[PDB]
Amino acid sequence: GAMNSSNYAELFNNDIKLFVDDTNVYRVTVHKTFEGNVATKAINGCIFTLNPKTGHLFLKIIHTSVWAGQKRLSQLAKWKTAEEVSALVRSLPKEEQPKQIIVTRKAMLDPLEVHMLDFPNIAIRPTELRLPFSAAMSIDKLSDVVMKATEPQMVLFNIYDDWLDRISSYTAFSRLTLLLRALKTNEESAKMILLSDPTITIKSYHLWPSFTDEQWITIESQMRDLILTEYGRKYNV
Amino acid sequence: MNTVPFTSAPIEVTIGIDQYSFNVKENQPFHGIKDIPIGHVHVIHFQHADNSSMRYGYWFDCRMGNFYIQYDPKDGLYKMMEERDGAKFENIVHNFKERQMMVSYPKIDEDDTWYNLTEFVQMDKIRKIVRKDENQFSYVDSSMTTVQENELSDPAHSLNYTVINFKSREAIRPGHEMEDFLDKSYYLNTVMLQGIFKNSSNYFGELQFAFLNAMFFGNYGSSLQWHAMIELICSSATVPKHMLDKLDEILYYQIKTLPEQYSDILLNERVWNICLYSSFQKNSLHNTEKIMENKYPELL
Numbered sequence A: 001g002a003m004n005s006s007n008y009a010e011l012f013n014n015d016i017k018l019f020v021d022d023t024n025v026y027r028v029t030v031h032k033t034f035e036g037n038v039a040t041k042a043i044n045g046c047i048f049t050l051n052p053k054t055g056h057l058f059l060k061i062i063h064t065s066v067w068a069g070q071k072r073l074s075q076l077a078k079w080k081t082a083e084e085v086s087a088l089v090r091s092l093p094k095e096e097q098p099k100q101i102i103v104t105r106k107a108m109l110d111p112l113e114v115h116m117l118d119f120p121n122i123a124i125r126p127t128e129l130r131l132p133f134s135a136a137m138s139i140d141k142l143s144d145v146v147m148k149a150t151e152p153q154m155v156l157f158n159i160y161d162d163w164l165d166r167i168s169s170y171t172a173f174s175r176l177t178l179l180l181r182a183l184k185t186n187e188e189s190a191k192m193i194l195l196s197d198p199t200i201t202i203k204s205y206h207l208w209p210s211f212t213d214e215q216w217i218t219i220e221s222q223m224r225d226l227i228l229t230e231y232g233r234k235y236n237v
Numbered sequence B: 001m002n003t004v005p006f007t008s009a010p011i012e013v014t015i016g017i018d019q020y021s022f023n024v025k026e027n028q029p030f031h032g033i034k035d036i037p038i039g040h041v042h043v044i045h046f047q048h049a050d051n052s053s054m055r056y057g058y059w060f061d062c063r064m065g066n067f068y069i070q071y072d073p074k075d076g077l078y079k080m081m082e083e084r085d086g087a088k089f090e091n092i093v094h095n096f097k098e099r100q101m102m103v104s105y106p107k108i109d110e111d112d113t114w115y116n117l118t119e120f121v122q123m124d125k126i127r128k129i130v131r132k133d134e135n136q137f138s139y140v141d142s143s144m145t146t147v148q149e150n151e152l153s154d155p156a157h158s159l160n161y162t163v164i165n166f167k168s169r170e171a172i173r174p175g176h177e178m179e180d181f182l183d184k185s186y187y188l189n190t191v192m193l194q195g196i197f198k199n200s201s202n203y204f205g206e207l208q209f210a211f212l213n214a215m216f217f218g219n220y221g222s223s224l225q226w227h228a229m230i231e232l233i234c235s236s237a238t239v240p241k242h243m244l245d246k247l248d249e250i251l252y253y254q255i256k257t258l259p260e261q262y263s264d265i266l267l268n269e270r271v272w273n274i275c276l277y278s279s280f281q282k283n284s285l286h287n288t289e290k291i292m293e294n295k296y297p298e299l300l
């Protein structure tokens, strides 16, 4: 069934699983027309498919050409996500295919179940966690490859950089979700925290800065303060 | 007009014949049921006074043989039986009727209700859903499960309804996943109508039979089958016009006949709201929507 705080450690066991997030698949800017009506212009999107144990991210870039001439785009986007996840699973060797796929939004359950009918043994699950994966486009290098794409494209990342050399996948996921929650609540503050010190750089083959263990403790503390703050600024507390 | 006599009535029982019913007391001198209209299937059904649990009964067609009910004190139920011999069947009935302790099937001449509920129901198809080939009549009761229910445990006592499952490879063409799930016309017209049922009359017959088993026996898997067959039509964008017209008539008489007090368990809110207000056919069931709204507006 559903994934929640009670079965949280299942994410880091040795059964291959993938989180799928569709928030950023169908992305638009809203604008006025010359006649003063409103219109949308789509921009490139992405499916966020992540193995929480390994950090492997399968970033499927959704080019705006896939919406041309289509109707009911918000509904299509869910089926397009399910099509691409299904195509990803089929592309993986049997021993790499997931045993579970956890969707971050319940509206993905039926589209993905129908597309995975050929895989009756892969469990499709919702979650009660409020995960901050929509903030993936706040990661500069991920945003950059999405916006630059001129055609459909799959790009592979490790969202944990080299963290697993020093920490467990539970701790790596906790760090990731804290960073993303901060980036979602106040992108600018979050990004200032991460880059304020120009002596700490992002390796060409990484997404986040090369912090020592001690600097990550400081950074992690600053992100919590930010999240608590914004929670005050928002609610006045 | 045909007759289903009774050897005796040894236990207190409410007896149903089609949509009619009457109470018989323990060892009352009850002889059976006469004047049963020929040309329709019928169902004779039973609820014991001492155990309202297990409604049970028999689907039959008097053109297919001579039938009578007698109580079995070992199995503790009223059993339907056949007399292959005719003269002796008429002979046994002959003494019993001058002494007229036999209820008359009480049909009003204006009344097409039973016909409207059984228009497409055939005994030959009933006997394929209820498998017991040594008898010409079919036993059903409250607790029998369907083939599909057993997939999710005795197969000889199952209701072999046609399996409908909207999230199945049968229902969904590879490459038309979104199209076929949101518009089931492929599944209805090609898979089920052309493929399995062959024509809409057979489809409607199973639908009507599932409803009647839900209503008369409170058979839950039958209710699931009735709603599934309605939803597959309502969720198809492309349905022959004659099937929609006839569906509206079928459902109207089903809703009309349903006991007012059983609506809470026999009607699925989701399906009916979807079918009448969201589905492709939301505007095609005028009679059914009108009676539903005037009789069960709470459900909606």
Ligand SMILES: O=c1[nH]ncc(N2CCOCC2)c1Cl
Pocket: B005, B006, B007, B008, B068, B069, B082, B083, B088, B089, B092, B093
């Ligand atoms: O055909 C029959 N054969 N055998 C007994 C029978 N009975 C027993 C007396 O009551 C009526 C039913 C009938 Cl009708």
